[PDB]
Symmetry: D2
């Protein structure tokens, strides 16, 4: 998270951290608890080579990474079959927890949004995660979960920006319909926020508009952060997740 602040203990109870097995259970991506036994994250986080569930683990909302851990095994990993590389979209994936988690005031699902919901500029939206605080600047210990309000923009506007100072023809589309852009030169996601949630408060309710997909610009002018637009994938998501 670039340009944000440490999150209040009470915020984002659906924020999760995906851990892979190395010298320790190291965070490699973020994700969200959309259902008691399901986690929404990014495809690029799980691929490219199919992984062994024994190596992955899910950690629930935690003020400080690695402190009070309690890893959870995963029974199933589903990566959208259209996914091949971030720049061509379909960067979304699901993790089936091994068993439901005890939902409480401190830990629960986030509501997915209505298919009709586009998220026009002005909508108050925040990205959260344990990513770098700047280009090649890791989140320093004790690793507080951070958040940052980011302006959301329309795809065609984002597409125009991406062509600025680039060789790519104006007529070739960079930003796809299954993507959503947010952030400016001072506020953005950054390395390690991938898979995590972009949430907007609509009618007093928090909805997950996106899944951090491209988090490497770290607030780079004319290259806002790119997110997988959840509305575009509800049917796929509901093909595996209930309620």
């Amino acid at each position: 998270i670039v340009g944000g602040q440490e999150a209040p203990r009470s915020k984002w109870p659906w924020q999760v951290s995906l851990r892979v097995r190395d010298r320790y259970w190291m965070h490699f991506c973020g994700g969200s608890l959309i259902h008691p036994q399901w986690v929404l994250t990014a495809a690029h986080c799980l691929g490219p080579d199919v992984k062994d569930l024994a190596t992955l683990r899910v950690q629930l909302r935690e003020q400080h990474l690695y402190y009070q851990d309690q890893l959870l095994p995963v029974s199933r990993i589903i990566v959208h079959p259209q996914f091949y590389i971030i720049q061509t979209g379909a960067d979304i994936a699901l993790l089936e927890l091994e068993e439901p988690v005890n939902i409480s005031s401190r830990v629960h699902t986030v509501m997915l949004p209505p298919a009709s919901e586009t998220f026009p500029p002005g909508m108050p939206c925040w990205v959260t995660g344990w990513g770098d605080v700047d280009n090649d600047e890791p989140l320093p210990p004790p690793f507080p979960l951070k958040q940052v309000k980011v302006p959301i923009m329309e795809n065609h506007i984002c597409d125009a920006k991406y062509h600025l100072g680039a060789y790519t023809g104006d007529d070739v589309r960079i930003i796809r319909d299954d993507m959503l852009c947010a952030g400016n030169s001072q506020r953005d996601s950054c390395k390690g926020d991938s898979g995590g949630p972009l949430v907007c408060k609509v009618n007093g309710t928090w909805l997950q508009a996106g899944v951090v997909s491209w988090d490497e610009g770290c607030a780079q002018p004319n290259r806002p952060g790119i997110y997988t637009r959840v509305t575009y994938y509800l049917d796929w998501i509901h093909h595996y997740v209930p309620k």
Copy 2:
């Protein structure tokens, strides 16, 4: 070049080295002389952002990189407008030299293939360049130009290979028609060979079949090196390159 050998001083008089100014005029990609004043290379080598001409120089055939540099200025950089990323093809570009080069026996142009040429498996082909000799193993000094013979395969055969061990659905195509695959677990291009030539001898003549596009495999099984199929872009090349 992974698994090759140093090239004979007489071979590949079309090979060029693209240099960017850092503490010195450092090699960052290969290229090929296709006309006395035109160099053929990969688009991703010049991208993403539009580059200023004054930061780039071209170096003609050298047995050893950096030893006898005679850097040449570039007057025009033309990146294919369809190019955005390696995985979506159109990875090709042209550099117009500020001046034409003195053609001789040590240095001359390589011939482009007939639009009809498909370079089917079993065809005798070589990849050349100053790229790494293995993963995370840079070409050691004195940086001899290397070469390695590679088995060119068919697109669908490559497409299939790329799906092995991948979440990507056999439904979605990975290898496009403007791409060409070659190399195996022993012979392949590697980091730094990018933009260089893949040439094959056809009926007694060397023809440039491809341009190194994806060289990060370095002989990784089932992920062979990907090249830009030159036949596919002859129209686009001839719009700029005469003779």
Copy 3:
């Protein structure tokens, strides 16, 4: 600490972490509270050049580094004047806290040994710290204080060990009288434990035998960790820290 275990919340209440300000107050050396207002550490930790007091903080006993910090400012830094380099001894220093500290069973001083006290072999001693767990293997987060019991050995035995596999002359002393060696190929101190305590329980009382001086062996055979012999510098220490 190599081959040790996480330490119980109740053990080693005199352990301290020295922080230098960078992107965050990063741990660079250990130390021991030996008086309500004085910390004992290694001279090589504060040198080579004189340091700005403001760049230094002291963190008292803590189970996990960074998680519950209560950084304390230092009023004086006193490096033993005889110190030039580790290998020539006198690797010892004193930090006078800006203010005395409240003592509890969780945080209190460690007693220095009597001038005559000797820690012959077979004697049970422990070394604690937040240093690497192995060569180039940083202690992973949440950085629990680690501990390990180490065999104290006889200098001449240590001196001879250090001459094994080296060109240095058998007749040239490597291990000085103000030094003391402990550890073996399985248990030892490692990068980052420097400045910390080597304590041995004697007559039912914990006494600090040494200060980690040379901790880069990380359980290397024939290169056991070297500590500064606290007894040797009792006079100097006493000339600054009362009682």
Copy 4:
């Protein structure tokens, strides 16, 4: 070499490069040809662990490192027995080549100084090598041999300077009599020059005054490069080298 320039091809015919077998025959230290079959260098270059002669070769004067290697085997290495660490001196060693070298105008020995020559300030002296051109800045390809004129200073003044900004007591000697200091804040040796020569022109003849010993300062104010004073070791040298 810091603040220096490329050496004319006709200069320093005695410079040598010591190579260690890694991915290629890599330079790890300089040295000088002091006799058709003997090379003078620094002990620290050859240790600490005893080296296997199979992994070592000597390369005679070359204008550009690695470009025209003709590696030479070594039959014997003699590390001064008093050597332990650079800071305590005796940093000197000898390498006996398997065969004498044919001496030509391009490659020949450097003369050792008379026991009485003290090389006072003002003497015109030069240090040569292929080390870094500044702190953490490697000499770039094509790796020209570099040279730089350095002002020689008196041992006691050098010793005084090394105590400025240091905790080390003025009564503790840093610069020993077997040491010699040269260089200033703009001109000096740098990492990789170690082992190479410090030569001064005396009465129209080049005499090797020192062996680069401490070369990590790279023109750090009040921390001039330290060299092993050759006259101090003439006897040890002549015990092995003929003529």
